[PDB]
Design a protein around this ligand. Structure first.
Ligand SMILES: [Zn+2]
Ligand SMILES: [Zn+2]
Length: 91
């Protein structure tokens, strides 16, 4: 076999959208199917866990509502909020 990046998309979860990582994962005491219809869990094909919701949302402080495009001119603002810069790279 060659270097195949093809990810396991085949399965019962061949739905038309990908759910959001259960921020609690397997630690959520909700086992009702609805909990899984919008959140993916550790074992789901739709699970990724690379989202802030699933790994961490805080880092250290609240996030700047304007992102890195925040034009709010204040050093204290930059101190209180996270100006989350994104890779947006094609590697
Ligand atoms: Zn859950
Ligand atoms: Zn800002």
């Amino acid at each position: 076999g060659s270097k195949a990046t093809d990810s396991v998309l085949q399965g019962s979860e061949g739905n038309k959208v990908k759910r959001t990582s259960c921020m609690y994962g397997a630690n959520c005491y909700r086992k009702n199917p609805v909990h899984f219809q919008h959140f993916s869990h550790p074992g789901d094909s739709d699970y990724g866990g690379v989202q802030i919701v699933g790994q961490d949302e805080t880092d250290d402080r609240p996030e700047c509502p304007y992102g890195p495009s925040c034009y709010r001119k204040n050093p204290q603002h930059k101190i209180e909020y996270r100006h989350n810069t994104l890779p947006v790279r094609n590697v």
